Amino acid sequence: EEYVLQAGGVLCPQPGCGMGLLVEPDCRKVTCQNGCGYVFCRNCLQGYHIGECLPEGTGASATNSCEYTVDPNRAAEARWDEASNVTIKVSTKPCPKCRTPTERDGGCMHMVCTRAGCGFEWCWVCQTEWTRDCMGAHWFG
C-alpha cells in the first residue's frame, strides 16, 4: 500500500477557532492540538463517540417493529354414503336340461339354451323338448 490520498477533514467547532483540522483515514481522534484542544466528533459535536452520526440530523424517525404469528387449522371432515334399497328381479327360467337361467329374446317366441355344456332347444310358448309333437308348429314370431 503506497498511494497518497486524502480523507474528509473538519473544523474546530469553536466560534473563536476555525483554523482547520486534518483528519486522516486511519485517524480516529480529532482534537485542536494546534489550537484550543478539545476532543469532539468529526461528524458531530458530541465530544467524540463510537458509532454512527450524521450532521443536520440523521433523518431517522422510525424503521421496523412488528412481531406477530398466527396458527392454522388443517382440520376438516369427510364422509360418504354409498346407496340404499336394492330391488332385484328375475327374468330367466331354469333350463330343463342344465337348469341354467335362460332369458327370453323379445321379438321371437323361440328360445334355445345357449350353454357351454347343453345346447338344448325348447319351445317358448309351450315348454317341452323338441320332438314331433311341437317341432315348431308355432315357431314363428
Residues that bind Zn ion (CB under 5 A): 12, 14, 17, 32, 35-36, 41, 43-44, 53, 95, 97-98, 113, 115, 118, 120, 123, 125-126, 134
CB of 103 to Zn ion, least distance (A): 12
Q: Which residues contact 129 (CB under 8 A, 6 or more apart)?
A: 96, 120, 122
Q: Which residues contact 26 (CB under 8 A, 6 or more apart)?
A: none
Is 111 or 113 the residue whose CB approaches Zn ion more closely?
113
Is 10 or 41 the residue whose CB approaches Zn ion more closely?
41
Catalytic (active-site) positions:
108
Q: Return the sign of the alpha-carbon dihedral for residues 15, 50, 58, 43.
A: positive
Q: Judge whether 27 is annotated as a binding position.
A: no
Is 12 or 111 the residue whose CB approaches Zn ion more closely?
12
CB of 138 to Zn ion, least distance (A): 6
CB of 124 to Zn ion, least distance (A): 7
Is 6 or 130 the residue whose CB approaches Zn ion more closely?
130
Q: Return the sign of the alpha-carbon dihedral for residues 45, 46, 52, 55.
A: negative
Please give the C-alpha separations between residue 115 and each of 31, 42, 121, in angstroms, as whole numbers. Answer: 120, 112, 11
3-state secondary structure of 110: strand
Q: Judge whether 12 is annotated as a binding position.
A: yes
Q: Judge whether 66 is annotated as a binding position.
A: no
CB of 10 to Zn ion, least distance (A): 10
Give, as one character, the DSSP assignment of residue 56. T
Burial label for 47, CB within 10 Å (0-12, 13-18, 19+), is: exposed
Cite the annotated binding site for Zn(2+) by residue number: 12, 17, 32, 36, 41, 44, 49, 53, 95, 98, 113, 118, 123, 126, 134, 138
